[PDB]
Design an enzyme around this catalytic site. Structure first.
Site, PDB file in Angstrom:
ATOM      1  N   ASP A  60      -0.668  21.934  33.226  1.00  0.00           N
ATOM      2  CA  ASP A  60      -0.419  22.772  34.374  1.00  0.00           C
ATOM      3  C   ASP A  60       0.914  23.488  34.172  1.00  0.00           C
ATOM      4  O   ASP A  60       1.902  22.888  33.744  1.00  0.00           O
ATOM      5  CB  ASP A  60      -0.429  21.895  35.641  1.00  0.00           C
ATOM      6  CG  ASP A  60      -0.546  22.693  36.895  1.00  0.00           C
ATOM      7  OD1 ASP A  60      -1.624  23.275  37.146  1.00  0.00           O
ATOM      8  OD2 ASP A  60       0.461  22.755  37.635  1.00  0.00           O
ATOM      9  N   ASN A  61       0.892  24.803  34.411  1.00  0.00           N
ATOM     10  CA  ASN A  61       2.076  25.670  34.329  1.00  0.00           C
ATOM     11  C   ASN A  61       3.121  25.272  33.299  1.00  0.00           C
ATOM     12  O   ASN A  61       4.276  25.122  33.634  1.00  0.00           O
ATOM     13  CB  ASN A  61       2.697  25.765  35.715  1.00  0.00           C
ATOM     14  CG  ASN A  61       1.715  26.338  36.676  1.00  0.00           C
ATOM     15  OD1 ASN A  61       1.430  27.536  36.668  1.00  0.00           O
ATOM     16  ND2 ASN A  61       1.075  25.469  37.416  1.00  0.00           N
ATOM     17  N   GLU A 111      -2.063  26.264  30.578  1.00  0.00           N
ATOM     18  CA  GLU A 111      -2.336  27.181  31.662  1.00  0.00           C
ATOM     19  C   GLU A 111      -1.075  28.023  31.935  1.00  0.00           C
ATOM     20  O   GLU A 111      -0.426  27.870  32.953  1.00  0.00           O
ATOM     21  CB  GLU A 111      -2.779  26.491  32.947  1.00  0.00           C
ATOM     22  CG  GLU A 111      -3.097  27.482  34.084  1.00  0.00           C
ATOM     23  CD  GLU A 111      -2.342  27.197  35.367  1.00  0.00           C
ATOM     24  OE1 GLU A 111      -1.542  26.244  35.359  1.00  0.00           O
ATOM     25  OE2 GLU A 111      -2.491  27.974  36.343  1.00  0.00           O
ATOM     26  N   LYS A 147      -8.864  23.604  46.999  1.00  0.00           N
ATOM     27  CA  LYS A 147      -7.591  22.981  46.684  1.00  0.00           C
ATOM     28  C   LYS A 147      -7.092  22.224  47.898  1.00  0.00           C
ATOM     29  O   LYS A 147      -6.425  21.219  47.752  1.00  0.00           O
ATOM     30  CB  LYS A 147      -6.569  24.038  46.241  1.00  0.00           C
ATOM     31  CG  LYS A 147      -6.862  24.679  44.897  1.00  0.00           C
ATOM     32  CD  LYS A 147      -5.807  25.709  44.516  1.00  0.00           C
ATOM     33  CE  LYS A 147      -5.855  26.932  45.388  1.00  0.00           C
ATOM     34  NZ  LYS A 147      -4.735  27.818  44.920  1.00  0.00           N
TER      35      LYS A 147
END
Ligand SMILES: OC[C@H]1O[C@@H]2O[C@H]3[C@H](O)[C@@H](O)[C@@H](O[C@H]4[C@H](O)[C@@H](O)[C@@H](O[C@H]5[C@H](O)[C@@H](O)[C@@H](O[C@H]6[C@H](O)[C@@H](O)[C@@H](O[C@H]7[C@H](O)[C@@H](O)[C@@H](O[C@H]1[C@H](O)[C@H]2O)O[C@@H]7CO)O[C@@H]6CO)O[C@@H]5CO)O[C@@H]4CO)O[C@@H]3CO
Ligand SMILES: OC[C@H]1O[C@@H]2O[C@H]3[C@H](O)[C@@H](O)[C@@H](O[C@H]4[C@H](O)[C@@H](O)[C@@H](O[C@H]5[C@H](O)[C@@H](O)[C@@H](O[C@H]6[C@H](O)[C@@H](O)[C@@H](O[C@H]7[C@H](O)[C@@H](O)[C@@H](O[C@H]1[C@H](O)[C@H]2O)O[C@@H]7CO)O[C@@H]6CO)O[C@@H]5CO)O[C@@H]4CO)O[C@@H]3CO
Ligand SMILES: OC[C@H]1O[C@H](O[C@H]2[C@H](O)[C@@H](O)[C@@H](O)O[C@@H]2CO)[C@H](O)[C@@H](O)[C@@H]1O
Ligand SMILES: OC[C@H]1O[C@H](O[C@H]2[C@H](O)[C@@H](O)[C@@H](O)O[C@@H]2CO)[C@H](O)[C@@H](O)[C@@H]1O
Lengths: 649, 649
Positions: free
Chosen positions: B380-381, B409, B520
């Site tokens: 993630d990020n 990502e 989400k």
């Protein structure tokens, strides 16, 4: 150890051969060092260049800026000093003060956490203050710290006290840098001015003789020197000065069989009288040569000797070192070629049987001529000898004598041309003569003034003995005038071969680039006096061009160059800058017809605003104009080839 | 000792970070190695690629060819084998036989020195014979030597006997190579098939529950797996499976304050119940997870877990390792951001107080999940943590476990995206979703299939929970069909996020890429059965695409890709090849209007002559056509998005 540092600094340029060969500069020359610099997250970075001299001493604070928004490509200009092997490093770092400032400017008006934000700024500024050596500068930053912490004052007032010009000025000079990260050093070889800048004149001493003794000597050829220095040249390039063979000697106009008195081609080096360390007896002796070189020097002329690693069939090497030639099964040596050109009068060298012996002898030869004041060698067809041979030779010679300059006459493909420069040739001949349209000229000079300038220094000979372009053949004197302006303004090194001034433009035949009755194969006496009194020579234009170059720093560099648009395909415009000196040139590439056009200057690229109107002087005429965004020009061939204007201070 | 060798071999590609990081492949993947090769003088060169495996063993004879005439750029295709760290070298050499041949073909008809020339060829061929291990091949070359030396035969006859196909064949396999010169070795990291090729499906287990227990568990979520395998996916990517915090928990549609039942965002990791090494209690236990992974494996599904290095305010790390966060002067920690997006529900990690402790813990966490059969991590990020941190982590994990695959990502700028791959991320998310026009698609895939393929392996998710593109919002089902076809045929890895099949396309509001009522922030149950019986799902198209990929090697690679012109801006055409498998795709990018166009195939780029007419089968329909140079197509949205044709052998 990781490959990336804390703050990524990647792909530093210039780079040559992945860092295995040095990037190039000369004394006083400026160029851009760049890198890709960024960090994780959203906070600001900064970067600076650290240039280190041969003794390892760091240059001045040289901050970089991002070159375009969102690209993460940063750049700064650096300037070479003394000659030798330098290095450059890019330091990247977090810029917390810029970051804080950005957030503060928004949060403080929005009333979000004003006390916490302002305290955070105070502690940043205190850390910056702890590094500042100046007492006044330190006082200035502590005064802002105090202001930022004064909880009795309004938020926006407290903040404003940390954003004053005098706070900015301190921080520009001594920024708070977090997490400083450095690239590995890259090498820079800085060489003397002449490697980049100089005007070259080629002539054959043997053609400057007398009615009694047609074959000129070094003593008689010396009389041409004052005229050459008076035209503003710095370098005299001589064709081969050694004895010339008799077997397979070429006659006039490249004919196969010489007749009794034919002098042959100077590049057919060597006879029983001597080889490459000897003087052609008809030119005189070594002592006469020393006289020639001394007299050149007093006129501010350096001599460049031709170095052609090849032999006539009568060169002593043929029997003394037969393994320096490739022999066919019947023992013969095939004459040299560059198809469809044949050189029946010479043998090429073979390098793979005795590479050490060839290296030793080559550098002994060069050192001999060096001991007699020749510090510049024009190397003939270097691309027909091994690249690694030239690399080793140049390294050996520059190892003891870094001032020596080598010019590569490699009219060949890009890869070889580039590589020759990268392995150590200070200068290169170029494709200039085959770039005559505005599109050809613009494209080629963009290439030469771009990344290639980190390894190649171009020498724009507008003509050579082997190259008389159709443009000059069909153009006449107006064409010679244009090409002279172009060469002399587009490269900081240019050159002409004797007779260019007189607009000699008769080819061997239609569609050839050979001259008719070429000086390579015959003595070619010239009535210099008559040409001068009858005004049939462009020697005054040539002289003026060299004076303008000597008077204008912008024309003594290569990399700063910009092409400004025009509405005429025949008319080309460009500018070059060095400090406050700016030169602007407009050329009519049409030699037959007057052309009128509108020139639209990129004013910011000149360092001006769009609406500004600034004065110029056409240095060819002395006439003055006031120019700006759009300008009418009218150029009549014969009367004016171009405007070569300086922007007036 | 020189930088350039006897025969110049320069600028070998692929190269990453100047050789400081490896170029990439997977098992069975082919790619082009290139270099710039030339020599002094006018004789020919040759070059070959020497690929060396992890144990150092050389691959097969892989001769190169010059890629364009007069360029001196040479290339050959190589193929990666087993996994590990390989090396590649380019060998350059003089090719005296090609040279001799050229001269002979001209001289022998011209009657010039025929005896000497033929003897010179004899001696070359003899040397060639001394290298040939084959006895039959040696005999064949000595027979030619004899023929060349037979002074009783006509010159042209003697020559022709050295130019026969069977002489060529021996010489092509075992050439006489003069002066062999090698580049320095460059590194190649060869990884498993799944790094390049695989189809991905993302879903949230918690949404697959029951009427009694809406919040799904790993035991109930497992029931979705069979349908996912049946659509032809290979990888299931799960959002974070750990406990979710309570402080600053987000409510439905990204609202700031959660209410009593709100489940929060899985990326808000950690509570008193556990952190990144724990399972959300409402999903069950580690044993339930093992069951999920086991059942996935039996269906040929690998699991990719999300790895998000960040915390909720209730993560144990907040009190256990406070120095892993940056605290403001009042002690508080600023919540994480990606402006203008705010993540009030999480704290970002600070890396500069205890980098070693963060590294140690990160890799322990990854190894924990690895011990439970998770061999793929979706990171993630990654761009909001340091690049060198990712470099050290990936190197540590792949050091002991080279099969583990990391997907970045990083929807960020090119520099960071490129660098993250180059420091070791096996796969990357991409700009795919923002490439919807023919120009955008063609440009971007040319980039991805070009030099970037030496370091970056793309994963084309047609949608993500954070990205519902306007093209899908405005396009409806026909848009979903198009994007699926593209993603599946343009990259050998693609993916979808659950609900894509149902053509869910309602944004949060006009001009947003968020879904309305995003999964989400809420449980999102779906009537999969009804959608199947009512045909309101594009699951059959998806399944067909994955079958076609499984059946066609061409679609399991990236680098071979060519765009063929069409006369319609809305219609795009391309081809991909792997051995004898060729797939040709024509897509209507217009989701609202039927488009008819003429597709003009580059036939040579297909390996065909211009006049040929090859049969094809549209694998979407089973229909057959005969296609060639110019082909009419007609594509009606809703009925056909594209033709996905295989060329029939
Ligand atoms: O908010 C300002 C911005 O808003 C609008 O942009 C949209 C865009 O139209 C959408 O398609 C999408 O963009 C995608 C891109 O498709 C995708 O490629 C990637 O973008 C990356 C770029 O490809 C990459 O080159 C780099 O971008 C740099 C860029 O080269 C610089 O030129 C600079 O961009 C500036 C623009 O020139 C300027 O006009 C404006 O942009 C508008 C835009 O007009 C509008 O249509 O601002 C920026 C200056 O910040 O900077 C960027 C670096 O930030 O890197 C980007 C990705 O970082 O990803 C995006 C989206 O993820 O979405 C945007 C709105 O989000
Ligand atoms: O048929 C041969 C050739 O004849 C004519 O060439 C002229 C030309 O018009 C003149 O201006 C001059 O050429 C100069 C160039 O101006 C100068 O750039 C340089 O050329 C170099 C190139 O810059 C460089 O790209 C490379 O050239 C390669 C080239 O990339 C290849 O594509 C290949 O070229 C082929 C051409 O496709 C084809 O047209 C023809 O060339 C003509 C030319 O069109 C015509 O105008 O054949 C060649 C295949 O042999 O090969 C070359 C490498 O050979 O490197 C060259 C270095 O030469 O220098 C030349 C002068 O040397 O003079 C020529 C007269 O010959
Ligand atoms: O006598 C040798 C040879 O010299 C010439 O060619 C030179 C040319 O002048 C150089 O500029 C460059 O092309 O290298 C050549 C070889 O040194 C003559 O033009 C040629 O006819 C002659 O045989
Ligand atoms: O829980 C924090 C955060 O989660 C989401 O943002 C994600 C996004 O979905 C990820 O895939 C990636 O972009 O990083 C983000 C956080 O790790 C929500 O969209 C957001 O509202 C929420 O605050």
């Amino acid at each position: 150890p990781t490959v990336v540092g804390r703050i990524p600094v990647l792909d530093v340029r210039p780079v040559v051969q992945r860092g295995r060969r040095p990037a190039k500069a000369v004394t006083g020359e400026s160029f851009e060092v760049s890198a890709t610099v960024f960090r994780e997250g959203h906070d600001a970075v900064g970067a600076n260049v650290v240039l280190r001299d041969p003794r390892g001493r760091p240059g001045p604070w040289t901050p970089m800026r991002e070159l375009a928004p969102g690209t993460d490509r940063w750049g700064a200009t650096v300037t070479a000093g003394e000659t030798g092997t330098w290095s450059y490093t890019v330091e990247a770092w977090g810029d917390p003060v810029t970051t804080w400032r950005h957030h503060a400017r928004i949060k403080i008006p929005a009333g979000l956490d004003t006390d916490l934000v302002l305290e955070e700024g105070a502690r940043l500024y205190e850390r910056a203050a702890a590094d500042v050596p100046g007492r006044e500068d330190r006082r200035e930053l502590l005064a802002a710290v105090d202001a930022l912490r004064d909880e009795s004052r309004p938020a926006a007032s407290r903040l404003a006290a940390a954003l004053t010009p005098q706070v900015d000025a301190v921080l520009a000079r001594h920024p708070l840098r977090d997490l400083v990260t450095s690239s590995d050093p890259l090498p820079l070889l800085v060489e003397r001015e002449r490697a980049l800048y100089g005007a070259w004149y080629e002539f054959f001493p043997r053609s400057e003789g007398t009615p009694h003794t047609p074959h000129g000597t070094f003593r008689t050829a010396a009389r041409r020197l004052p005229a050459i220095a008076a035209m503003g040249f710095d370098v005299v390039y001589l064709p081969p000065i050694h004895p010339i063979g008799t077997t397979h000697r070429k006659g006039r106009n490249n004919t196969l069989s010489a007749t009794g008195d034919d002098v042959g081609v100077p590049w057919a080096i060597g006879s029983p009288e001597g080889g490459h360390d000897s003087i052609h007896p008809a030119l005189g002796t070594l002592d006469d040569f020393d006289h020639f070189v001394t007299e050149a020097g007093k006129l501010g002329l350096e001599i460049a000797l031709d170095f052609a690693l090849q032999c006539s069939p009568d060169h002593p090497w043929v029997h003394k070192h037969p393994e320096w030639f490739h022999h066919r099964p019947d023992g013969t040596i095939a004459h040299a070629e560059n198809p469809p050109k044949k050189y029946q009068d010479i043998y090429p060298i073979a390098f793979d049987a005795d590479p050490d012996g060839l290296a030793t002898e080559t550098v002994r030869i060069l050192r001999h001529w060096m001991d007699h004041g020749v510090r510049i060698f024009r190397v003939d067809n270097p691309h027909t000898k091994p690249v690694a041979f030239w690399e080793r030779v140049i390294a050996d010679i520059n190892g003891t004598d870094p001032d020596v300059i080598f010019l590569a006459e490699a009219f060949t493909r890009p890869a070889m041309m580039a590589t020759l420069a990268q392995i150590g040739f200070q200068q290169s001949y170029t494709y200039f003569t085959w770039r005559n349209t505005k599109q050809e000229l613009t494209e080629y000079l963009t290439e030469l003034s771009g990344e290639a300038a980190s390894y190649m220094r171009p020498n724009f000979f507008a003509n050579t003995p082997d190259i008389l372009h159709a443009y000059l053949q069909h153009g006449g004197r107006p064409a010679f005038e244009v090409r002279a302006v172009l060469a002399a303004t587009l490269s900081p090194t240019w050159g002409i071969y004797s007779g260019y001034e007189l607009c000699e433009n008769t080819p061997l035949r239609e569609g050839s680039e050979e001259y008719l009755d070429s000086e390579k194969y015959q003595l070619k006496p010239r009535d210099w006096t008559r040409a001068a009194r009858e005004g049939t020579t462009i020697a005054p234009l040539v002289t003026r061009l060299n004076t303008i170059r000597r008077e204008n720093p912008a024309l003594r560099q290569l990399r700063d160059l910009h092409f400004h648009p025009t509405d005429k395909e025949e008319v080309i415009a460009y500018s070059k800058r060095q400090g406050s000196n700016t030169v602007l040139v407009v050329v009519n590439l049409d030699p037959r017809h007057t052309q009128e056009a509108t020139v639209s200057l990129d004013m910011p690229q000149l360092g001006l605003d769009w609406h500004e109107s600034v004065p110029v002087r056409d240095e060819l005429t002395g006439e003055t104009y006031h120019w700006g965004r759009a300008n009418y020009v009218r150029l009549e061939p014969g009367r004016t080839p171009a405007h070569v204007c300086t922007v007036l201070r």
